[PDB]
């Protein structure tokens, strides 16, 4: 007849609320760490969210489902492509499993370091803390008993002009200058 | 309980899902050897790699191409339904080494003769099967002729 | 936007393939493994049933094939079918006449191809 | 032929001999049971697919320790095969 | 390996694999009963089958 699955088991979430209540909606905002830009999700993004790839023709229900059965219920037959795609899906699983295994082996042998990132990265990035042990990172220890005061970020939107509407404030504000084009 | 969760404790590592967002031909050959070791050929490809330090050393160099996402191995054991008591070590110990493009071998000739050797092993399997049969039959005929004459 | 923020967890959605597929019974405890381990090892299409047999529609790997000439193995097996002089073809390691130009630094070029890369060739051909 | 969702029951069957090959026979029995009821309803008399699946069913019984069940079933297979037009040469072989 | 391409008869036809395992099982049984001529008859048959193939 007709088939609809988002899943391997055919299961799903309770697509409709109980009568008279409020619905749960998907977050409309694009998923981005910074709060400010605030973009809505793209068509593409919605396609990723709904469990396809970015395209209608891969990874979704629009792949995994047969195009046709026979009328009496006999199912269709295996393409070279269909088989190849199954091998792809298994290639992802083998990838995941193998990777995980490598991590577990490495940790078992104690090769998982306690210092985040590598040496190349640590020397690039002043975010990761100096992991120095028995000394204080910055000089000798601070005594136990605010940069914003003296540092000014004030972006001046409009540039203040010279007062031609006053005769004296015109001459007093004089900038003595000769403009020079580089040579 | 405002206290430290009493354990036996387990340590759980991570897994990098890496997706390549730019054409590798735009970039120098170093960045391409890195993108290769991350197993990423073209724009649009996606891979899963371990979180061990070498891999991070790689991702660090290509970070202006690749976009990355992390899963701790619990989250991963969930992402595919895997019973919690089954680790990944045994799951990996089960699956066949013969899985596609099995190895990393140094040159395309060596790759050729690796596949070649694979086939040859098949032939020798069926041949050795037949020969085993002939050996056993030879034995039955010898014990039969020896027990019949005697 | 071509800059798309979303976990790349979706670029590889696993909803269709859980471990149930590669390990068929993992909800029991037994870790049997059925993997289709390449695209190479595909056997071919096979009918589900006697009732709906596979249609015969050809590809270029069939629809274009010539008639069989007897090779050396066939005439060894059964000399009855060596009936004429055209069967007597020589060692199979004879390819044919030389069909092209061996052009220095470019391959074997084709006759009526590009002579753009023949300079060294033409000059080689006339002869501490 | 009467409609049966053969895709899902086939699915169910392949899961069945995954169970069998994996060494747990009772479950393969249950699964084959379902699939056999389905095919039994879906195909006419003595059709190849019927005798195939009840061969498998016989094999599942045998492994569980229901022996006379296996016996009876495999004899049904045979006297079915005889009554067929032109049976699969692989099926008579598998059967016996 | 395009020259050396090989396909095991135990796959591309299931019939031969079935009869093979058939005779294997059979021969085992004969070795337990203590029947020699049976065992030899059956092994020889199995061989002839394999090299027919």
């Amino acid at each position: 007849y007709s088939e609809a699955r988002s899943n391997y088991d055919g299961t799903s979430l309770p697509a409709w609320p109980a009568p008279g209540k409020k619905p749960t909606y998907p977050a409309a905002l694009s998923e981005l760490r910074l709060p400010q830009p605030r973009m809505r999700k793209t068509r593409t993004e919605w396609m990723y969210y709904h469990g396809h790839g970015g395209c209608p023709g891969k990874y979704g229900p629009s792949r995994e489902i047969a195009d046709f059965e026979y009328a009496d219920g006999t199912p269709a037959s295996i393409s070279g492509r269909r088989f190849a795609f199954k091998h792809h899906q298994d290639h992802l699983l083998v990838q995941l499993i193998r990777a995980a295994a490598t991590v577990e082996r490495y940790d078992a042998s104690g090769l998982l370091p306690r210092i985040p990132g590598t040496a190349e990265q640590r020397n690039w990035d002043p975010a990761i803390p100096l992991f120095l042990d028995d000394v204080d990172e910055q000089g000798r220890p601070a005594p136990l008993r605010d940069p914003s005061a003296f540092v000014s970020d004030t972006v001046k939107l409009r540039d203040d002009k010279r007062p031609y509407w006053s005769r004296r404030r015109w001459a007093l504000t004089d900038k003595f200058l000769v403009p020079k084009s580089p040579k | 309980a405002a206290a430290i969760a009493p354990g036996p404790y387990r340590r759980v590592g991570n897994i990098f899902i890496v997706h390549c967002d730019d054409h590798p031909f735009k970039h120098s050959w170093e960045v391409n050897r890195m993108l290769r070791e991350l197993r990423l050929e073209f724009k649009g490809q996606t891979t899963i790699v371990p979180d061990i330090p070498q891999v991070r050393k790689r991702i660090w160099r290509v970070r202006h191409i690749v976009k990355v996402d992390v899963l701790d191995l619990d989250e991963a054991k969930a992402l595919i339904g895997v019973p919690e008591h089954i680790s990944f070590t045994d799951l990996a110990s089960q699956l066949p080494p013969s899985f596609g493009r099995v190895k990393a071998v140094p040159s395309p000739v060596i790759r050729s003769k690796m596949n070649f050797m694979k086939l040859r092993r098949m032939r020798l399997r069926d041949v050795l099967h037949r020969d085993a049969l002939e050996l056993r039959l030879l034995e039955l005929k010898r014990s039969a002729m020896k027990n019949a004459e005697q | 936007r071509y800059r798309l923020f979303h976990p790349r967890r979706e670029a590889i959605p696993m909803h269709m393939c859980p471990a149930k597929t590669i390990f068929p019974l993992i909800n029991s405890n037994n870790l049997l493994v059925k993997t289709r381990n390449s695209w190479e090892d595909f056997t071919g299409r096979k009918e589900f049933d006697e009732d709906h047999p596979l249609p015969v529609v050809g590809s270029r790997l069939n629809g274009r094939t010539t008639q069989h000439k007897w090779n050396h193995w066939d005439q060894y097996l059964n000399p009855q079918i060596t009936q004429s002089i055209k069967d007597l073809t020589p060692t199979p390691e004879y390819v044919g006449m030389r069909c092209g130009h061996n052009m220095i630094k470019m391959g074997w070029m084709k006759i009526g191809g590009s002579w753009k890369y023949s300079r060294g060739y033409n000059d080689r051909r006339r002869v501490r | 032929r009467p409609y049966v969702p053969l895709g899902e029951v086939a699915k169910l069957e392949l899961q069945g001999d995954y169970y069998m090959e994996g060494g747990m026979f009772q479950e393969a029995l249950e699964h084959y049971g379902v699939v056999a009821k389905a095919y039994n309803y879906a195909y006419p008399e003595n059709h190849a697919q019927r005798i195939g699946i009840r061969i498998k069913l016989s094999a599942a019984f045998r492994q569980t320790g229901r022996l006379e069940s296996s016996l009876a079933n495999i004899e049904e297979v045979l006297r079915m095969l005889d009554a067929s037009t032109r049976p699969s040469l692989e099926l008579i072989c598998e059967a016996l | 390996e395009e020259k050396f391409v090989y396909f095991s008869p135990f796959d591309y036809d299931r019939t031969f694999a079935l009869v093979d395992q058939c005779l294997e099982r059979a021969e085992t049984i004969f070795n337990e009963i203590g029947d020699v001529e049976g065992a030899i008859r059956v092994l020889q048959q199995r061989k002839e089958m394999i090299d027919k193939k």
């Binding site: 891969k58 070279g80 492509r81 088989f83 190849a84 795609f85 091998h87 792809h88 290639h91 | 197993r39 990423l40 050929e41 073209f42 649009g44 490809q45 996606t46 891979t47 596609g100 493009r101 395309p108 790759r111 | 695209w39 190479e40 595909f42 056997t43 071919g44 299409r45 096979k46 009918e47 596979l54 590809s59 790997l61 | 037009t85 032109r86 049976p87 699969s88 040469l89 692989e90 008579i92 | 396909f7 591309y12 036809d13 019939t15």
Partner: peptide, 29 residues
């Protein structure tokens, strides 16, 4: 170059993929 087959790869078309018929018992027997 060498292939990693990292993306999805359609298989090749090769002769062993021919659809082989099921040998049948003769009609009379």
């Amino acid at each position: 170059v060498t292939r990693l087959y990292t993306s999805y790869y359609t298989g090749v078309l090769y002769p062993n993929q021919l659809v082989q018929p099921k040998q049948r018992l003769p009609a009379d027997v």
